[PDB]
RNA sequence: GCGAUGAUCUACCCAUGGGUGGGUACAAAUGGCAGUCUGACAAGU
């Protein structure tokens, strides 16, 4: 993150850090904390993006796209790690199965608090449904219209 | 001998190994996990003085062990000792393999390896109950399939039955077997060769080691347990043979 | 008065010991099936009851490895078993065996709570028949006296060496007949005080230490109008403070 | 020209690079050798450039096994991906040192500008590596070697012997130790608090003998006055007053001449009775586990004979392992009655053989010598 | 996907051959007959190899013996008819498996060992 | 309508009852071994 961060930060070379990110979910695909900073950086370079095409034609959904595809794969692969970090018959292999969806789950609820807002969590929850979560899931469906 | 006979137990020569002197003596190795013999002798019970334990020994059947019938014989030197590391190939099971991880000790280790499966089962429920043996289940000629598992061992004990002895031999030992390092072969001449004669099959394997950089120190032959058989202690060199 | 049953004493003893010895080989065999499974915890807790209570608050490496242990062990040691739970040898158990396993650590838990309570019961009891060998050589050693002299009564007739000598019977009378030098503890080596002494005091302090319970039981055991405030036992404990401090004063050396 | 080499460890994977090439003609001497011995001069030859370890105890499984194979793993192909510079892989290739030959075509058809040498100056090197081990890393690695080698051992060699959960006996073994255990010292505590109780009531201890429903009555009748006709009626919802047993006990309690006991007394009494109550209810529930596990394990041998003598056999013969193992006359070992009693060892060493070496044994084999061994009955 | 239980199993050359020496055994007094004789004489160490039936109801019964003979490092073969066993063994009813001991004054001695060469090529 | 998936063999009285007798694992015994040390000095100045 500090190597990514300072490249991007004082020389500002996004291509410099997208590989370095990259590279750093390679060698750990198990890290939440490095899933969630790459969006980050991906939404921050989206918005300075956007705000330089405003001045540009105040002087004169891809983005979500890529940063949701990133979150696919991101809990595509911390389900797969937080199964094999600990691979058993059916119901501890079941239950098993319910601690790490709860897991991914409220990982994801962290994603929301990090949140075309009302698109971002419409295709979060999308994903989500393709108990208790989800009364809690038609709650977030009731606030994003009142949001 | 009996189920109630008492006996005076005594340090052999060797470390780790002892003899149980009575009307007959019985050579004994401190059990490890005391209260379960792997295969079925008899052991020895003494009591110790907090409250006073029960500390157990186990007897050593030299008409089925390879290695207690050179123990009994007499080698002058076994590099095997109360705190070493000890790859032992051709480990068909606890018979042998369990006496060698109660001599080498809760501090040494013993890596035991062996090909085929059923006992394989029977190595990784005795290694389940014995905590300083690592179990191998694959073939053991090819050092490089399993060079995850072993980091430089101290001695090699060898009871493969195998006609390419030497060369498997020579290859675990340049891998993994310490310089300086004790060889321990238990050949059977019947195996390597059928045809001729048992000494020329002894002279045959030993020129073989010396050839494979391994410097024979001593031979015994074992005769009163087994037929044909030898026990060749070498040391492995790597330099200056001479 | 309805309290005064030392028939109740001596079934508490005996009890006692029973107890303690059959919760220690029920903890065995629970080490055994849960290092059957586990085979690292037996050589990081010895602490059977901390075992038991492990095994009711995780059942598998991955809630060895998530779950919180403050309240049983150590930080240091907690987290030694989570490096080992992350890295085990042994295999993994089926929901039915969980269950017995379970139940087992339970009843060890039930039996350390039984034991302690026992154990006060019969401070209690002793605080409330013979109180003033209670202040005196505490509520465990003078069980012991009573349970084994029988009664209080017969414990009372006795002499003062007998009762120094009590427990060690053994080496008393093989060395009677064998003409050597016989014991001078007994069962007043666990009492408090001979704790305190320091080899030649040990033994002087056994000696009038057993005098002072001699003095004590004849008061309990006799008395008609006892006050059950142990008064004569703070005397004697407070006799025998003053001559161990004086005699730990007396030196041996030069100055 | 030997630039990089990689070691596999239990705990990860480690780069060296070269310093220094070790000269190639006088490898078989003595000072070469000496040099390859003394750690004054391995850190000449060698210096630790990069090192990844593994990241739980299942990726080191699936690495290993991987390694063994010979294959590239995932993790393997992003540490050469990170370290190995892209130089042209026409002219001047870099050249990795590897142990295994078979390991590596896998490393070249994945990066085509390394090529990879195991001689025997390669396998000096790499053999002076796993000589210093430790003492290389400057403090990196974390974790302890040999439990990690312990580990890793044991996992793959029972991954590779395809190990099972059925055919776990142990479980059988302490379950049958336990219930012996449990059936001991249920009768000591029994007549214990039997005896203490019965110094307050030895009409009711003589009158009743079976000992959880006397817990039962202890736990119930606190003293032997506060007894009406509705706790009769309540007796009578316990054990039995058709027997008359409760009419009994509350005329001998009215007439009692038991010495009366301390409230606190009764209490802890109270207190034990419902500690034993509790152990006989866990022993009837480690009764009924045995059985099932006896039908689910050794269900040939349960049908013949019975779960409690088939654990007791498993037990006496050390394990099921051995049972099966042994001859059909040394399972006797551990005049019609005798001859009958030498058919039955037949027969159940026999379903012993089957009920352990089948992978998910069968009660209609079991049931077949069952009832070949009643006909034989039948016969005599 | 695995092996069979049985396995290894001969060929029918290599059956006649077998059976050819089990049958002067048996005249000879060298073979012992049966399971649990079979099982003594591994114990022992008296045998030489084993031949085992591979369709006998069911197949564990006998396949308790290739862990004896794999721990002891004896040879073992399985041939396809318990029947042609018995027949060939000289016993008036079904054998399902046999042990040819040792012997050194043994008439047969180069027999023995040409077909228990075969054997160990087998495996 | 047999058998290698195993045939055969491994103390005294009263014409398949009771009465003598010996031997191995577990319990109870206020049954036995089995009898509760010495007795005027000691320490300081």
Redesign the interface.
């Known amino acids: 993150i500090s190597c990514a961060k300072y490249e991007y930060e004082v020389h500002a070379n996004f291509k410099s850090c997208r590989n370095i990110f990259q590279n750093g979910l390679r060698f750990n695909p198990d890290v939440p904390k490095l899933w969630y900073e790459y969006v980050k950086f991906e939404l921050n370079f989206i918005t300075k993006l956007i705000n330089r095409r405003k001045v540009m034609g105040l002087i004169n959904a891809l983005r979500g796209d890529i940063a949701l595809t990133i979150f696919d794969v991101c809990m595509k692969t911390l389900g797969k790690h937080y199964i094999n970090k600990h691979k058993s018959d059916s119901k501890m292999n079941i239950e098993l199965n319910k601690e790490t969806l709860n897991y991914l789950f409220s990982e994801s609820l962290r994603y929301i608090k990090l949140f075309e807002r009302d698109y971002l969590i419409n295709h979060v929850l999308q994903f989500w449904k393709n108990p208790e979560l989800y009364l809690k899931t038609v709650m977030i469906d009731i606030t994003l219209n009142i949001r | 001998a009996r189920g109630g006979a008492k006996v005076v137990i005594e340090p052999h020569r060797h470390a780790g190994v002892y003899i149980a002197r009575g009307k007959e003596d019985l050579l004994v190795t401190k059990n490890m996990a005391p209260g379960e013999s792997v295969y079925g002798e008899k052991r020895i019970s003494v009591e110790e003085p907090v409250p006073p334990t029960k500390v157990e020994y186990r007897v050593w059947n030299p008409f089925r062990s390879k290695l207690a019938a050179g123990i009994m014989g007499g080698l002058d030197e076994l590099f095997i000792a109360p705190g070493k590391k000890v790859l032992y190939l051709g480990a068909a099971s606890g018979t042998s393999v369990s006496h060698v991880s109660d001599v080498v000790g809760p501090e040494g280790v013993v890596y035991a390896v062996e090909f085929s499966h059923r006992p394989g089962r029977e190595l990784i429920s005795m290694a389940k109950k014995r905590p300083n043996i690592i179990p191998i289940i694959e073939d053991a000629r090819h050092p490089q399939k399993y060079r995850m598992l072993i980091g430089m061992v101290d001695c090699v004990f060898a009871d493969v039955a195998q006609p390419d002895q030497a060369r498997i031999i020579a290859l675990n030992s340049h891998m993994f077997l310490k310089d300086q390092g004790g060889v321990v072969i238990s050949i059977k001449a019947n195996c390597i060769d059928s045809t001729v004669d048992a000494e020329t099959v002894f002279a045959r394997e030993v020129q073989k080691l010396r050839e494979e950089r391994i410097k024979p120190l001593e031979q015994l032959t074992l005769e009163p347990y087994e037929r044909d058989h030898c026990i060749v202690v070498g040391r492995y060199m790597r330099s200056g043979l001479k | 008065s ?2 005064k ?1 030392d ?2 004493i001596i ?1 508490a003893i005996a ?1 006692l010991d ?1 107890l303690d010895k ?1 919760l220690n ?2 903890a065995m ?1 629970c080490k ?2 849960y290092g ?1 499974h586990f ?1 690292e915890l037996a050589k990081i807790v010895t602490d059977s009851v901390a075992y038991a209570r492990i095994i009711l608050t995780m059942g ?3 809630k060895a ?1 998530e779950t919180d242990l403050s309240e049983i062990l150590p930080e240091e040691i907690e987290e030694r078993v989570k ?1 080992a739970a ?7 158990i ?4 969980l ?2 396993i379970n ?2 650590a339970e ?1 060890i838990v ?2 350390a709570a ?1 034991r302690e ?2 154990s006060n ?1 019969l401070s ?2 002793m605080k409330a028949i013979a109180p003033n060998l209670t202040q005196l050589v505490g509520e465990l050693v003078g069980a012991r006296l009573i349970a084994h002299s029988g009664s209080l009564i017969s414990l009372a007739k006795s002499p003062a060496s007998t009762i120094q000598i009590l427990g060690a019977e053994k080496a008393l009378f093989r060395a009677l007949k064998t003409k050597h030098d016989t014991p001078k503890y007994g069962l007043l080596y666990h009492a408090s005080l001979v704790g305190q002494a320091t080899g030649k005091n040990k033994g002087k302090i056994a000696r009038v230490l057993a005098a002072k319970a001699a003095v004590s039981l004849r008061y309990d055991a006799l008395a008609e109008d006892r006050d059950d405030s142990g008064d004569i036992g703070l005397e004697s404990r407070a006799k025998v403070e003053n001559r161990l401090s004086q005699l730990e004063g007396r030196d041996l050396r030069t100055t | 020209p030997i630039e990089y080499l990689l070691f596999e460890e239990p705990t990860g994977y480690a780069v060296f690079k070269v310093k220094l090439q070790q000269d190639d003609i006088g490898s078989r001497l003595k000072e070469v050798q000496e040099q390859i011995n003394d750690f004054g001069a391995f850190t000449k030859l060698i210096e630790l450039v990069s090192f990844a370890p593994f990241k739980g105890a299942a990726e080191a499984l699936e690495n290993a096994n991987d390694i063994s194979e010979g294959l590239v793993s995932e993790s393997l192909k992003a540490i050469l991906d990170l370290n190995l510079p892209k130089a042209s892989s026409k002219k001047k290739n870099i050249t990795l040192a590897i142990s295994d030959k078979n390991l590596g075509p896998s490393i070249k058809e994945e990066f085509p500008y390394v090529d990879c040498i195991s001689n025997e100056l390669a396998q000096d090197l790499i053999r002076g590596v796993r000589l210093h081990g430790e003492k290389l890393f400057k403090g990196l690695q974390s974790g302890d070697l040999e439990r990690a080698q312990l580990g890793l051992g044991h996992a793959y060699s029972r991954a590779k012997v395809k190990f099972s959960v059925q055919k776990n006996d142990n479980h059988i073994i302490q379950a049958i130790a336990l219930l012996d255990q449990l059936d001991k010292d249920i009768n000591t505590f029994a007549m214990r608090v039997k005896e203490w109780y019965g110094w307050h009531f030895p009409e009711l201890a003589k009158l009743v003998p079976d000992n959880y429903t006397f817990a039962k009555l202890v736990l119930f009748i606190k003293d032997k006055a506060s007894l009406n006709d509705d706790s009769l009626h309540d007796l009578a919802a316990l054990l039995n007053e058709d027997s008359g047993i409760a009419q009994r006990v509350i005329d001998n309690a009215r007439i009692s001449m038991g010495q009366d006991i301390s409230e606190t007394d009764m209490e802890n009494v109270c207190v034990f009775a419902q500690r034993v109550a509790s152990l006989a209810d866990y022993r009837r529930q480690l009764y009924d586990y045995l059985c099932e596990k006896m039908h689910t394990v050794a269900p040939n041998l349960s049908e013949l004979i019975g779960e409690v003598i088939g654990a007791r056999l498993i037990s006496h013969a050390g394990s099921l392992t051995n049972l099966s193992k042994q001859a059909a006359s040394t399972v006797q070992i551990l005049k019609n009655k005798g001859r009958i009693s030498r058919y039955l060892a037949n027969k159940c060493s026999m379903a012993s053989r089957i009920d352990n070496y089948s992978e998910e044994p069968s009660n209609v084999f079991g049931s077949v010598l069952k009832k070949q061994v009643e006909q034989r009955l039948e016969f005599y | 996907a695995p092996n069979p239980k049985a396995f290894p199993l001969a060929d029918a050359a290599l059956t006649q051959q077998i059976l050819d020496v089990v049958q002067q055994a048996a005249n000879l007094r060298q073979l012992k007959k049966g399971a649990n004789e079979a099982t003594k004489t591994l114990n022992r160490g008296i045998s030489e190899f084993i031949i085992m039936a591979a369709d006998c109801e069911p197949i564990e019964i006998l396949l308790h013996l290739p862990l004896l003979c794999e721990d002891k490092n004896v040879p073992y073969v399985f041939v396809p008819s318990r029947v042609a066993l018995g027949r060939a063994c000289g016993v008036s009813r079904p054998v399902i498996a046999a042990s040819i001991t040792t012997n050194d004054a043994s008439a047969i001695k180069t027999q023995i060992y040409a077909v228990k060469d075969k054997i160990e090529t087998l495996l």
């Open positions: 309805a309290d049953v028939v109740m079934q009890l029973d059959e080989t029920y065999r055994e099936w059957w085979p598998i490496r991955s490895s490096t992350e890295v085990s040898m042994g295999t993994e089926t929901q039915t065996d269950d017995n139940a087992l009843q039930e039996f039984y309570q026992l019961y209690a009891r």
